[PDB]
Amino acid sequence: FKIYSKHTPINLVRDLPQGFSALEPLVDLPIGINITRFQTLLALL
């Protein structure tokens, strides 16, 4: 489950701007499991 990742020093707050920047192979997960759906999970009136 390859995790390509990168943080770029953007300076803005809203919709993704133009420009160019690559990502990097930050970590792989040498499992062989099956995955077909994901779900976001934040730091949960």
Place this chain on the structure above:
Amino acid sequence: TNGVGYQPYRVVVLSFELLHAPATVCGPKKSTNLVKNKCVNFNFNGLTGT
């Protein structure tokens, strides 16, 4: 007080199964020392050449 026949053989039957959860209990390498400026053969992370 019983016999060595009863004396337990500390037994580890190595139950291993193959071709699932890709091979993870594996075989290591044995290194050498680096050489330079010599037409030689080499092996690097599977990659081999001269």
